[PDB]
């Protein structure tokens, strides 16, 4: 609305500056953005309060940035905070008061809660509201009557239409409450599972659980925790908390195996009580209460096998007290989201290390699952030592002239290969590998295109890993890498970042990436976040290097791809050249070698 | 024309002006205190000597170490013609005025005795409005003499007759300089433009020295009041009070410390975001020169340092050095704790963006090709090298290029060489 002679939005006509603004560490913008002095004496209280009421945008070292959202406001009401309570404390923290536009915005979002609640009973879904009249106006659109099946008033809703109705309810300004009173529920039988005292719960984990379990009723939503932060333990703890039949869904069979191990590792539950409903393996799922499977299995669009149909019908008919969803960034997919309509679950908890995707469907998680129940501050976890200090870097590999000549000439998809394969990027990786290998550092090499992966790994005489590599060959390489001292690096394709349980490594070199996507970048970095046998956070023991070809599309993709990491606070140090690479003996030391590779690169046709 | 120190101006002085400039009231004190730590001793020693001494004595009075500094200081004082070898006898006017300066050799009704804080605040205020006029402010203080001064100072240029003056490449660089350095360049340009416009530099410059401790002086003094460097309650008062800025004068950041003795306010985040705890729009205008401003609060502004805003600044003429300096000199107390104060990623990115802007170095030149022999080619090359006219050479490829001006000399030589036939 108001803009100065400069592009900055100004709010002098919108809010005043309080008398003790120097003591107050926060500002409230009329557009919903919020800033917080991380160095302020009350930062601790303000951080908790802003994580409770707002959505974090950036959390750098000196000033954090947040924005208000209906979902974040609903979460605030979900922990019992009244409009006056958040307003009074926000005004007290705000050094420039609260703009009336935000105050009235908060009013609407606060009063629009508690009015309508969705609950399921006897495999039937009922929409309840305390006020009886609200239903009459809320039903004024036939989409609800067609969705509706043919005090505390309620009506039953057609299961298949719940997704459409729930999304409408948001833009209809009447969100559905999803608190599940697992404590006062005798209809769904409890399960004999508890967290064994061997399990250790960290403060951030405890915070996320406390925020999810704001009362005796579990709240649905998404918890964002790094893979190294023990997201699996939180999920297992939530199941142990709900004490009712629960369904865990992983994005891969490897994850399903990981979950089984974690459940046995952290809970009193026995192996027979856990089943891994999977096409590749059978555990007689109907024989036990805890089930584990994948979106590909349940979400399967084609004809089901007769045996798998037996379990699925049993799964369909049973009601799940808790539905744990891992790597929910995939959930908004057209097929994966169908799982939410197929399975009947009282409360659904989503977990993921990278709640980002290149499509505008991430926001669906707010209605498909719920608001962000928690989102760890990765810098705080490093400061607390829970995550390894990773000195990220971007090596600006200069492209070779004969490569650039072709790269600039070829505008088709073939340039992705040419910018991925050049002597300088190759020599740089070989040099960094040799250096870290002679430094006795475990190194993981990452790539996308198999052609470059092969030609690099073969020229480096190192074992690569990719899709068609059988599980036996694949794991045998990991065991050698982990244990054999003579091997210290592995060349992994997307298989390593998509979904896997790779052994932790001190160093990671990414020579190729699918694009400027944030998701894959943070998934790759996640592999090195694991704490080592004797490291310390100030040691800067972990490393992460992105190899990019200067003056190429890789530069655009790389900067675009790092957005999520810089938002979390990571410093991508640019490396123009590495001292010693001029004298170290490396491949492509003569133009004929470059020409030979370039010729074969062109032969790719 | 980045005249970063007095020494450049000192060299720009002839004996016919030095002798007059070497007045007893202030020049001797100002010059002497500005001489190197070594030469000050010898000048004071020979203040009582009427007979010259050989350079060997000065040389042997200094160790082999520091002899270069003695030679350099000797070069300055000999360049200043303070003495003559006559074989280092001081100039009589210099010796006499230095002698009188040690002891010296005027009063009236009391003044308003305004408080020193008030004087320095309006002085800073006066300099600020000068900068507000210098920047693209929609409204600012103006004056025909101030405008033409900044224009003749090469800081501003008028694009169209009647349109407000705009900033030059030097002007943008100048705007980011620290107040003392920024004021220095202005003082230097005023002095140069003063002699150019007929104001006797001797009198006004000697007056500047006096302030650091005739109608021409009155006119000049009026400008100093308009610059806020001196206080005069009313144009009728024959007495004025020099402000802190005028007292500092040519002392530079080495005297009484740099302008860094001020509250820092810029915060720089690793995401290129800026937070400057400021209300003074001048700082905002400067920040806007190289960063995209996002939000403005009563006491702080939020901005981001992007490729667009920085490369635009670089294209306008700014340098990453000035930007990094402007930030570092304004860095907020909170970020002073980290070392370096600025985040390395930010500093490296800014430098890398400017270095990208000049990836291609363009140089005018004339290229000769098809040299019939390597001998005459190398002979002509040796002449081009001897003339310093060579721009680039590749003897293996038998080629060289030379500056267009220098080309006329090789063109003449080539014709001369060819006309030997």
């Amino acid at each position: 609305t108001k803009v100065d002679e400069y592009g900055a939005k100004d709010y002098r006509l919108q809010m005043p500056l309080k008398d003790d603004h120097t003591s107050r560490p926060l500002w409230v913008a009329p557009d919903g953005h919020i800033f917080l002095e991380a160095f302020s004496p009350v930062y601790k209280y303000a951080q908790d309060f802003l994580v409770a009421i707002a959505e974090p945008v950036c959390r750098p070292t000196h000033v954090h940035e947040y924005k208000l959202t209906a979902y974040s406001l609903y979460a605030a009401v979900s922990v019992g905070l009244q409009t006056s309570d958040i307003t009074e404390y926000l005004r007290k923290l705000s050094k420039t008061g609260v703009p009336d536009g935000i105050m009235q915005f908060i009013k609407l979002c606060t009063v629009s809660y508690g009015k309508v609640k969705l609950v399921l009973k006897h495999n039937r879904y009922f929409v309840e509201s305390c006020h009886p009249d609200v239903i009459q106006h809320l039903l004024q659109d036939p989409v609800i009557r067609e969705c509706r099946l043919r005090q505390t008033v309620s009506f039953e809703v057609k299961q298949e239409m719940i997704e459409e109705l729930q999304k409408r309810c948001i833009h209809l300004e009447y969100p559905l409450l999803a608190e599940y009173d697992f404590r006062n529920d005798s209809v769904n039988p409890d399960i004999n599972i508890d967290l064994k005292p061997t399990a250790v719960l960290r403060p951030y984990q405890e915070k996320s659980l406390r925020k999810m379990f704001g009362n005796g009723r579990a709240r649905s939503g998404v918890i964002v925790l790094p893979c190294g932060a023990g997201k699996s333990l939180v999920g297992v703890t939530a199941a142990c908390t709900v004490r009712k039949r629960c369904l865990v869904l992983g994005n891969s069979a490897v994850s399903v195996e990981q979950w089984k191990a974690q459940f046995k590792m952290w809970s009193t539950i026995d192996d027979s009580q856990i089943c891994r409903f999977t096409s590749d393996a059978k555990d007689k799922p109907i024989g036990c209460s805890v089930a584990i499977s994948t979106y590909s299995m349940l979400g399967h669009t084609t004809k089901r096998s007769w045996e798998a149909e037996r379990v699925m019908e049993w799964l369909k008919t049973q009601e799940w007290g808790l539905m744990i969803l891992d790597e929910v960034h995939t959930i908004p997919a057209k097929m994966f989201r169908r799982v939410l309509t197929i399975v009947q679950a009282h409360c659904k908890l989503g977990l993921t290390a990278t709640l980002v995707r290149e499509d505008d469907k991430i926001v669906d998680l707010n209605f498909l699952i719920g608001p962000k129940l928690y989102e760890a501050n990765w810098m705080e976890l490093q400061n607390n030592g829970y995550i390894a200090k990773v000195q990220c870097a971007e090596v600006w590999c200069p492209m070779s002239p004969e490569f650039y000549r072709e790269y600039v000439a070829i505008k088709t998809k073939k340039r992705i290969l040419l910018y991925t394969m050049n002597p300088n990027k190759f020599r740089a990786c070989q040099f960094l590998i040799k250096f870290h290998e002679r430094r006795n550092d475990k190194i993981i090499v990452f790539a996308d295109n198999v052609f470059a992966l092969k030609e690099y790994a073969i020229r480096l005489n190192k074992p690569y890993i990719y899709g068609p590599t059988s599980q036996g060959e694949r794991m045998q390489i990991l065991q050698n890498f982990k244990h054999n001292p003579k091997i210290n690096t592995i060349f992994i394709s997307k298989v390593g970042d998509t979904s896997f349980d790779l052994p932790e490594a001190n160093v990671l070199i990414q020579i190729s990436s699918h694009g400027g996507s944030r998701r894959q970048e943070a998934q790759r970095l996640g592999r090195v976040l694991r704490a080592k046998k004797g490291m310390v956070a100030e040691e800067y023991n972990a490393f992460f290097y992105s190899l990019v070809s200067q003056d190429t599309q890789e530069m655009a993709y790389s900067t675009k791809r790092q957005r999520f990491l810089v938002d979390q606070g990571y410093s991508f140090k640019v490396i123009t050249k590495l001292a010693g690479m001029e004298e170290e003996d490396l491949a492509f030391s003569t133009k004929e070698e470059q020409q030979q590779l370039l010729q074969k690169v062109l032969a790719a046709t | 024309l980045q005249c970063r120190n007095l020494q450049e101006f000192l060299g720009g002085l002839s004996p016919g002006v030095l002798d007059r400039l070497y007045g007893h009231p202030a020049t001797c004190l100002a010059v002497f205190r500005e001489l190197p730590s070594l030469a000050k001793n010898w000048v004071m020693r020979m203040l009582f000597l009427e007979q010259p001494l050989p350079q060997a004595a000065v040389a042997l009075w200094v160790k082999k170490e520091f002899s270069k500094a003695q030679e350099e200081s000797t070069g300055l004082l000999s360049g200043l013609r303070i003495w003559h070898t006559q074989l280092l006898i001081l100039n009589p006017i210099f010796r006499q005025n230095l002698r009188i300066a040690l002891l010296g050799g005027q009063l009236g009704p009391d003044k308003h005795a305004r408080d020193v804080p008030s004087l320095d605040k309006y002085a800073e205020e006066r300099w600020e409005v000068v900068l507000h006029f210098m920047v693209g402010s929609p409204s600012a203080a103006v004056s025909q003499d101030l405008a033409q001064l900044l224009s003749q100072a090469g800081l501003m240029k008028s694009t169209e007759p009647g349109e407000p003056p705009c900033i030059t490449s030097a002007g943008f660089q100048f705007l980011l300089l620290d107040t003392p350095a920024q004021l220095w360049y202005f003082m230097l340009q005023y002095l140069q433009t003063a002699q150019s416009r007929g104001m006797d530099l001797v009198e006004i410059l000697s007056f500047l020295f006096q302030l650091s401790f005739s109608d021409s002086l009155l006119n000049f003094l009026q400008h100093l009041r308009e610059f806020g460097l001196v206080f005069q309650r009313k144009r009728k008062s024959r007495r004025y009070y020099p402000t802190r800025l005028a007292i500092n004068l040519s002392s530079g950041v080495s005297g009484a410390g740099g302008t860094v003795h001020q509250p820092g306010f810029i915060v720089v985040e690793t995401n290129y975001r800026l937070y400057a705890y400021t209300e003074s729009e001048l700082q905002i205008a400067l920040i806007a020169l190289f960063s995209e401003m996002l939000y403005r609060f009563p006491n702080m502004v939020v901005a981001q340092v992007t490729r667009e805003s920085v490369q635009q600044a670089i294209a306008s003429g700014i340098t990453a050095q000035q930007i990094i300096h402007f930030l570092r000199t304004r860095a907020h107390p909170v970020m002073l704790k980290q070392t370096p104060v600025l985040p390395p990623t930010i500093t490296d990115q800014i430098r890398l963006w400017e270095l990208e802007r000049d990836r291609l170095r363009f140089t005018e030149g004339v290229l000769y090709n098809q040299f019939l022999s390597q001998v005459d080619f190398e002979l002509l090359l040796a002449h081009a090298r001897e003339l310093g006219v060579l721009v680039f050479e590749n003897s293996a490829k038998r080629l060289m290029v030379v500056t267009p001006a220098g080309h006329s000399d090789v063109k003449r030589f080539w014709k001369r060489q060819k006309h030997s036939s």
């Binding site: 000195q391 870097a393 250096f435 430094r439 040691e539 800067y540 023991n541 490393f543 140090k573 640019v574 490396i575 123009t576 050249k577 590495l578 001292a579 | 990453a320 050095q321 390395p344 500093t347 490296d348 430098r351 890398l352 270095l355």
Partner: peptide, 15 residues
């Protein structure tokens, strides 16, 4: 032991 390399110790940009 295990000290940071030079390329991570200092600015590699020419400035």
């Amino acid at each position: 032991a295990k000290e940071r390399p030079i390329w991570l110790r200092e600015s590699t940009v020419q400035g």
